[model samples]
Target: LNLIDMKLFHHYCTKVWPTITAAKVSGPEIWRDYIPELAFDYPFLMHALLAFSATHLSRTETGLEQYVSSHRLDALRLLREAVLEISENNTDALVASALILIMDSLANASVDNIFEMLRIDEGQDVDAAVRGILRNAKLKPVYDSLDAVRRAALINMVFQMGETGVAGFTNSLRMLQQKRWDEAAVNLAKSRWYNQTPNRAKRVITTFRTGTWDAYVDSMSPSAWIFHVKGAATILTAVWPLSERSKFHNIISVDLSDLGDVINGTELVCFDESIADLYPVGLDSPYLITLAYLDKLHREKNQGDFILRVFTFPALLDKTFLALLMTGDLGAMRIMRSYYKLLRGFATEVKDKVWFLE
Candidate 1:
């Protein structure tokens, strides 16, 4: 309530709601949290709701009966209350509130029920997987004390990272189910959501396909998370969080009236593990290093024609630096090295298509 910046809330409400809403409803019970009554006027909520609903409806083979039985209505009530808190206070928040509600819903909803709802017929007991994540995971704590703005910023960061995690989980599962080792290896390598345990990444290649870390890494592309983080960090760094105006930074830190608004804007930038692995190496110096690297390369190279390219070492270095800076952790650097190799492969493929066309 203290940090609510009306202008910043309005910006997210008008601009980035779609992405947030869609991500919140990755499941049916969570989907109901996005009722139009709560979010129709807000474009950011609407966007996230529509994107999630459409994606769910398109990809899921389940029927309406499953959707109804999922007890999302109860969760929706909680979500509605969260939103109402923001509105009644006239605070401008972001997507973090809504996302937290969805998170609560997911946390409470039975894993067995979610799988049933998804109709994931592979039958290897995803229940075990879900439970495993819940059990083994040392989950991040949801902030209860920060002003609405900082909370909102954190929320946007969480979803940004969460969405990537979801994508990686889905792709790997799909590939594993189909027994497509090569395709799965590629898909797994390209995953934005899940971090590749050295063992898991290796298992995917050796167990299912004819490859190694070197091969897979040599053929992979930089994940979308890289670009998003880079873009956001660049824009955010310019905004003065302590400012009193309705500028981007101001709103990010203050405008959010409720937790929902905060959730809408929240995006998780780095995992604890990733942070631990890269801090010693100065992996968190912001995008300046990578951006400068690109500029240097661009200046030195007199290219005959333009083409698509993925800067592997640069992107990994950026991720490593940022992760370390954000959390002061450096354990994930080894995994990053692998990711860098993957980006190299991605660059090679893109260069091939462009070079031929030229």
Candidate 2:
């Protein structure tokens, strides 16, 4: 292998794998130890591994930024060829490459076809149905009395619950007509949607239930966290084994609380003063999830870098948290910038430590 490839491989093992896969669930060590073991036997896995490493190093390293795309092209070309030669011959490598490929796509920015990950164009069609719902007599109060954000929420209900759902929700309209947010919200909480669409529905319900636009603004974005992760679904259709995802998913999907029970949840993450205000309390509060990733710098003066514990939270955890980041919610984005700041901090450190050996 060339020096550049060798450098990237070393970077992957020492820097990339250790931090990204520090989780207990879903078996993270595979990316660190096992994938590299398979990489020796499979050319496609090697190229894919290099591509994944470079995508990371391009972010983590300087002057090596542009190598990500070309390396990705190489991985993609070989993965395509390997598929045609598929069978029991190298199915393991093929699956490994696909996971690496999916993670690679997610790591890079600009999720252009995020909706391809979305099963449907809910934004386009949901609004169309939403507009239709306002004309209905019972739901008209939401349109007539409430603000646009509140109005947008009922539309989500219309799309999610069906046009007839508003009919089942009769007495609640009286509370809505009165703009009694407390009753209306609690009524929503005590309903079937809460049971049926537990994770996805809460935010909008929280919006109208509590009379807030935070969730409304969050729900507005289609390219939320899962937007990038949509490729995981594509890969699943085709992982490390689909059954394992449930363990990791359930492990991650549990919400963070006001108490700050996180691995990387420290002052290093809590850098932003203005944005991370009272919502240091919130889930989609933005900075909370990025904290998992931006631990590239040291914990203190002479100490080594603080390794990231898990990757699943914002990336694989709550849709709302991902929604907050994707929408570029100011508070979330602001704290995100702090992460990039430390990224450069680690920049000089890793360059000095890892590559300086050369």
Candidate 3:
């Protein structure tokens, strides 16, 4: 009756839970504490947990790749059966198991090194299967039944991995569909900046959406206006190239004078202090280098301090990847090269669907 062997269980308790807790600060702490309790009542949840733990272990421990493959198949089969047999009582467990599977798929999908080809292949298939399950109408009640903490965790996942425009634009879509351009514009603004209140975000959106360019400028505070401009530039750059010949090129010409102020006002931090603490070199070494690369790409003024401010949560490089980067692992460099090549292939396309990495 042992669902997970001692080795896998040890890995989950020692590594998986600790990692999830570190990443999600404000939480129902489901992975850290709740999921194990749920696993006691659901065999599917247990299998999924082991599968994820094994997948993670396979990265560091040699000879466990096959273990990951076998457990992943078992988890998938169990998940399908659980979904078919789901009732109100078991809905939460089913949803949680699906989430774990999704996370495992995302972890595997993020890298494309030769050492992990099987993981990449398996991850792509699992990711598609789980997303299909999540899109089911029957899962709606289960989602609604979740508490605020669990719901927030779920929302974070949706934002991280769900289809483009789904997480932040649900309310906006309804208004847009009804031809409420004014309200839809406001909702869109709020979606871009989650911290801003709906009313305040709406005011900014309304002014920009309806007013003349000069009027929009005069109405907004310097910092606010710069923030909006920067956001617009990001969207425009993705959808429309910033070449002089483009119609929207003028809109992309943002003033960076107040851009620093706006970025500082946001919740984005340069690095996760907790994650930095895990490495021996701390934040002073490869971690800082990684942050610098990200800051440059995002076009934020680097304050030399490791604290980042931005619209979305910054990507925390995997601990293993960080360790490799610090120690100069050639294997890690090759994996990163492969990732760069993959992104380069999709660079020309707007709204690249590299959900696996993000």
Top-scoring candidate (TM-score): 2
Worst 10 residues of 1 by lDDT: 302-311
Return the TM-score for each candidate structure: 0.24, 0.38, 0.33
lDDT per residue for candidate 1 within 226-331, as digits (tens), equals 4333432322222213234322223221232343322322232222122233333333345334333332333222111111112122223456456774574443
lDDT tens digits, residue span 1-358, model 3: 5534667977886677654433444333556676777777777677778888887776666667776677677876766555544343354465456546644654454322221222221233323323522464543443445433233323333433453324335565445445465566656654645453443343334433442222222232223112322332232223222234322223121312334433332333533222223233334344334433343333422211101122111133557566885688764564344333222222211112223232
Candidate 3: lDDT of 164? 36
| Local distance difference test, each candidate | 0.33, 0.54, 0.44
**lDDT of candidate 3 vs native?**
0.44
lDDT tens per residue, model 2, 1-358 = 5898898899877776654443433345566677788898888788878887887775545766567777777777776666565443355566566656655664553422222212222434412565557677777765688765466567666666777786677867788878887777778777777888765567766667543333333233323334433433433333323244322223222322333445425444443232445544544444554554443233322211122112222234346555776887776665554544443233234333333222
Greater lDDT among 2 and 3 belongs to: 2
RMSD of each: 21.1, 17.0, 24.5
For candidate 2, the per-residue lDDT at 201 reads: 68
Better of 2 and 3 by TM-score: 2
Give the worst 10-residue stretch by lDDT in candidate 3. Answer: 303-312
